[PDB]
Every structure is written in structure tokens, then in C-alpha cells.
Amino acid sequence: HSDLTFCEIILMEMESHDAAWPFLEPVNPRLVSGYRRIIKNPMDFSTMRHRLSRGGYTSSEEFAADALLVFDNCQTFNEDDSEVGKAGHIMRRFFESRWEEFY
Ligand SMILES: CC(=O)c1c(C)[nH]c(C(=O)N2CCC[C@@H](c3n[nH]cc3CN3CCCC3)C2)c1C
Ligand SMILES: [Mg+2]
């Protein structure tokens, strides 16, 4: 698959990005007050890595949906001027531009 090929490329670059530190592992709701109540479908890069490794993505569209979920959730829970929120805007702009320079 040429679609799955670029997903592996763009996931690799996001995992290694400087501003990827809030998204490398799932949020622990025990450690974050209100997260469980506010974020219905959590998502992060390791969950995407796991689903790609086991062949769980059909098309590149499903991969893009999970990536946009990460940043949608980030903007739903975190203030735009929080540390986590600022890293998410950097990561979201990176993904949007990189995804469009291929498709
Ligand atoms: C609540 C929220 O939307 C959020 C997201 C999407 N991500 C983070 C976040 O901060 N992390 C992600 C999980 C691991 C955390 C981690 N990994 N190694 C050490 C730490 C400790 N953190 C806390 C402060 C210093 C780093 C970092 C939040 C709050
Ligand atoms: Mg959107």
C-alpha cells in the first residue's frame, strides 16, 4: 500500500518531533482530573503505532482520523496557552502541512 507507506513515514516524524512529548503515550485519567468525563475517545501516537503494527488500518483516511483526534482532544481539554496546548498546535500544524504535501 502506498497510503500505508506514507502513514508510517508521517507517524515516524511525529513520534520524533520535539513537541510530541504530550502525545507519546495515553493520558492516565487517574492522574488528570476531569479527563475521563471530557474526552470521550482518547487517542495518542503509541495507540496509532500499535494499530499500524498489527495491520489495523484499512485506508490512510482512518489513520488521518486518529491523528486529528489527538489534536481535537488536545484542544478540547487544554487551554491554547497551556504547555500541552502549545505543543499540540505545533504538532497539529506539522501534521496538516505534511499530510497535504503528499495528498
Ligand atoms: C491532559 C492532557 O491533555 C495531556 C496530554 C494529551 N498529554 C499530557 C502530558 O503532559 N503527558 C502525556 C503522558 C505522559 C506524560 C509524561 N511522560 N513522561 C513524563 C511525563 C509527565 N509529564 C507531566 C509533567 C511533566 C510530563 C506527559 C497531558 C497532561
Ligand atoms: Mg477537523
From Swiss-Prot:
Record note on modification: Deacetylation by SIRT1 in late S phase enhances pRNA-binding, allowing de novo DNA methylation and heterochromatin formation. Acetylation is high during S phase and declines to background levels in late S phase when the silent copies of rRNA genes are replicated. Ubiquitinated. Deubiquitinated by USP21 leading to its stabilization.
Cysteines paired by S-S bonds: none
Compartment annotation: Nucleus, Nucleolus
Tissue specificity annotation: Expressed at moderate levels in most tissues analyzed, including heart, brain, placenta, lung, skeletal muscle, kidney and pancreas.
Domain Bromo: 1-102
Domain characteristics, as noted in the entry: The bromo domain and the PHD-type zinc finger recognize and bind histone H4 acetylated on 'Lys-16' (H4K16ac). These 2 domains play a central role in the recruitment of chromatin silencing proteins such as DNMT1, DNMT3B and HDAC1.
Family: Belongs to the WAL family.
Annotated function: Regulatory subunit of the ATP-dependent NoRC-1 and NoRC-5 ISWI chromatin remodeling complexes, which form ordered nucleosome arrays on chromatin and facilitate access to DNA during DNA-templated processes such as DNA replication, transcription, and repair. Both complexes regulate the spacing of nucleosomes along the chromatin and have the ability to slide mononucleosomes to the center of a DNA template. Directly stimulates the ATPase activity of SMARCA5 in the NoRC-5 ISWI chromatin remodeling complex.
Assembly with partners or alone: Component of the NoRC-1 ISWI chromatin remodeling complex at least composed of SMARCA1 and BAZ2A/TIP5, which regulates the spacing of histone octamers on the DNA template to facilitate access to DNA. Within the NoRC-1 ISWI chromatin remodeling complex interacts with SMARCA1; the interaction is direct. Component of the NoRC-5 ISWI chromatin remodeling complex (also called the NoRC nucleolar-remodeling complex), at least composed of SMARCA5/SNF2H and BAZ2A/TIP5, which regulates the spacing of histone octamers on the DNA template to facilitate access to DNA.
UniProt-recorded name of the protein: Bromodomain adjacent to zinc finger domain protein 2A
Full-protein interval shown: 1796 to 1898 of 1905
